[PDB]
């Protein structure tokens, strides 16, 4: 089997991407944030505290002939941005882009934090990290990808995120028309439950490439690129007027600037992030200070190749017995 679904930015800054997912029978279509940095499939639902719902489409298990309460199971998750959600669990039929899994754990939110309530475009998350991170207790549950795997033509999914444009998540096949040149594969560690890999270095604009190992995670659910303070300082030093602002919460730069590109290494390959991708626009409406798309990971504890980096590439998440990550230009 295979699946193929279009993923669409939620706003003009590509803050996140939503992908339609069919849940239950008859289908209830919810727009989920596919997140390679977590392992829970959770939704706004008929159980979500009413005051915490503001425009989202909800899953109503009582209207699904295939929904079953997973008795006694609960879940609770906190994300790197401080947001959180929790609730109970159903099993139901879930389809993404034509690929169907039966008996998928669908985690129904009873409570969500304010950032979720305030984002009316996101009806929940679909986790694509390793199932060892799944938060359901007392019986941990599998991700959609892990449940789908045995039916897939090939044990892979691919992320092809757009810059200010729709893109695609494919399951079970590599679309050889969706990238240019070759795909370069690199080793993954699952020790922390993430798609964790080691970049071979970086360059700023037209500068020389610095060979240096940077361990980090491929995370479609994080907007920005978070790298060591040394690397980030070297980048912003090339932008006149750029500085780190504790009041704003990171690097800002004059909106009149032209940003250099940023290159990261994947083995002997090089992925170039255009300067435009690194511009996240005014810090507040009408400001002439703009927020940077490359930020320090120093306060986070892990480097994160988020959407800023990933949308510059066609990315293969290879979930074979020995997992790997592939990157190609596009
Ligand atoms: O009552 C049940 O089975 C689920 C688990 C606790 C909350 N709701």
The DSSP H or E segment spanning 280 is strand 279-282
Q: How many CA atoms lie within 13 A of 90 on its CB side?
A: 25
Q: Which helix (H) or strand (E) holds 310?
A: helix 307-310
3-state secondary structure of 19: strand
DSSP string, 201-250: EEEETTSPPEEEEEEEEE-TT--SEEE-HHHHHHHHTTSTT-EEETTTTE
Q: List the domain boundaries for the chain.
A: 5-174, 175-330
- SS3 for 133? helix
Cα–Cα distance between 306 and 195 in angstroms, integer?
12
Strands laid side by side in the 196-204 sheet: 269-273, 262-266, 196-204, 210-218, 303-305, 225-227, 294-296
Q: How many angstroms separate the CA atoms of 134 and 106, rounded?
A: 12
Q: How was this structure determined?
A: X-ray
7 contacts 167 by C-beta, under 8 angstroms: yes
* Nearest by Cα to 118 from 51, 166, 58: 51
**193 within 8 A of 292, measured Cβ to Cβ:** no
If DSSP codes are grouped into helix, strand and coil, which group holds residue 195? coil
Pocket of ligand 1 (CB under 6 A): 71-74, 88
Ligand 1 pocket: which of 86, 88, 108, 137 to mutate (most atoms within 8 A of CB):
88
Which tokens is 40 given? 């829970």
Cβ atoms 231, 214 nearer than 8 A: yes
The fold adopted by the segment(s) 175-330 is Cathepsin D, subunit A; domain 1 (2.40.70)
Report the distance separating Cα 215 and Cα 187, nearest Å: 11
User: Following CA atoms 139, 144, 147, 152 in sequence, which dihedral angle do they give, to the nearest 10 degrees?
Assistant: -170
Q: State how far the Cα of 34 lies from the Cα of 315, in Å rounded to an integer.
A: 14
State the closest ligand 1 atom to the C-alpha of 70, by its place in the atom list counted from 1.
Answer: 3
276 belongs to the catalytic site: no
The angle subtended at Cα 124 by Cα 118 and Cα 298, nearest 5°, is 75
Determine phi and psi for 132, rounding to 5 degrees. -60, -15
Q: Which tokens sit at 231?
A: 């690397």
Nearest of 308, 324, 327 to residue 219 by alpha carbon: 308
Q: Is 167 helix (H, G, I), strand (E, B) or coil?
A: strand
The secondary structure of residue 189, as a DSSP letter, is: B
Active site residue 62: no
Q: Is 192 left (phi over 0), alpha (psi -120 to 50) or beta?
A: alpha
CA–centroid distance, residue 121 to ligand 1 (Å):
27
Is the Cβ–Cβ distance between 315 and 159 less than 8 Å?
A: yes
| Atom number in ligand 1 closest to CA 71 | 3
Q: How far is CA 23 from CA 20, 36, 40, 59, 164, in A?
A: 10, 20, 15, 8, 28
| Residue from 46, 67, 73 to probe ligand 1 pocket by mutation (most atoms less than 8 Å from CB) | 73
Helix, strand, or coil here: 16? coil
CA 36 / ligand 1 centre spacing (Å): 27
- What does the H/E/C string look like for 55-116? CCCCECHHHCCCCEEEEEEEEEEECCCCCEEEEEEEEEEEEECCEEEEEEEEEEEEEECHHH
Task: Compute the distance between CA of residue 3 and CA of residue 241 in angstroms, rounded to an integer.
Answer: 46
Six token digits for residue 197: 């890999």
Q: Which helix (H) or strand (E) holds 282?
A: strand 279-282
Identify whether the C-beta of residue 281 lies closer than 8 Å to the C-beta of residue 256.
no
CA angle (140 as vertex; 144, 94 as ends), nearest 5: 25
Find the catalytic residue in 45, 95, 199, 296. Answer: 199
Q: Which atom of ligand 1 is nearest to the CA of 69?
A: 3
Q: What sign has the CA pseudo-torsion 96, 32, 285, 228?
A: negative
Q: Active site residue: 14, 33, 35, 123, which one?
A: 35
Our mutation pick for probing the ligand 1 site, out of 42, 47, 71, counting the most ligand atoms within 8 A of Cβ, is 71
Residue carrying the six token digits 């997973």: 70
Residue whose structure tokens are 């090939």:
154
Fold topology of 5-174: Cathepsin D, subunit A; domain 1 (2.40.70)
What the block records as the tokens of 44 is 């706004």
Those residues with Cβ within 8 angstroms of residue 176's Cβ, 6 or more apart along the chain or in another chain: none
The CA angle 43-49-50, to the nearest 5 degrees, is 105
**How is residue 196 written in tokens?**
């964790």
To what resolution in angstroms was this structure determined? 1.2
Q: Considering only CA atoms, which residue is closest to atom 7 of ligand 1?
A: 88
3-state SS of 140-158 is: CCCCHHHHHHHHCCCCEEE
Task: Give, rounded to a whole angstrom, the gap between the first and last alpha carbons of the chain.
Answer: 25
């Amino acid at each position: 089997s295979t699946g193929s679904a279009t993923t669409t930015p939620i706003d003009s800054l590509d803050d996140a991407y939503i992908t339609p997912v069919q849940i239950g029978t008859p289908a209830q279509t919810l727009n989920l944030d596919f997140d390679t940095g977590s392992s829970d499939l959770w939704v706004f639902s008929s159980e979500t505290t009413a005051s915490e719902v503001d425009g989202q489409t909800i899953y109503t298990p009582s209207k699904s002939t295939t929904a079953k309460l997973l008795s006694g199971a609960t879940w609770s998750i906190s994300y790197g941005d401080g947001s959180s959600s929790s609730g109970d669990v159903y099993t139901d039929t879930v389809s993404v882009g034509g690929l169907t899994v039966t008996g998928q754990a669908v985690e129904s939110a009873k409570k969500v934090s304010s950032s979720f309530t305030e984002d009316s475009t996101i009806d929940g998350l679909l986790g694509l990290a390793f199932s060892t991170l799944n938060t359901v207790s007392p019986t941990q549950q599998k991700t959609f990808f892990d449940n789908a795997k045995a039916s897939l033509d090939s044990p892979v999914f691919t992320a092809d995120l757009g810059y200010h444009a729709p893109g695609t998540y494919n399951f079970g096949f590599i679309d050889t028309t969706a990238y240019t040149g070759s795909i370069t594969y690199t080793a993954v560690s699952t020790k922390q439950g993430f798609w964790e890999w080691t970049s071979t270095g970086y360059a700023v604009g037209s500068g020389t490439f610095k060979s240096t190992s940077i361990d980090g995670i491929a995370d479609t659910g994080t907007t920005l690129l978070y790298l060591p303070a040394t690397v980030v300082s070297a980048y912003w030093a090339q932008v006149s007027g750029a500085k780190s602002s504790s009041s704003v919460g990171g690097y800002v730069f004059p909106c009149s600037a032209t940003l250099p590109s940023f290159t990261f290494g994947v083995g002997s390959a090089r992925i170039v992030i255009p300067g435009d991708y690194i511009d996240f626009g005014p810090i507040s409406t009408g400001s002439s200070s703009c927020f940077g798309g490359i930020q320090s990971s120093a306060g986070i504890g892990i480097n994160i190749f988020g959407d800023v980096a990933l949308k510059a590439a066609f990315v293969v998440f290879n979930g074979a017995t020995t997992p790997t990550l592939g990157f190609a230009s596009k």
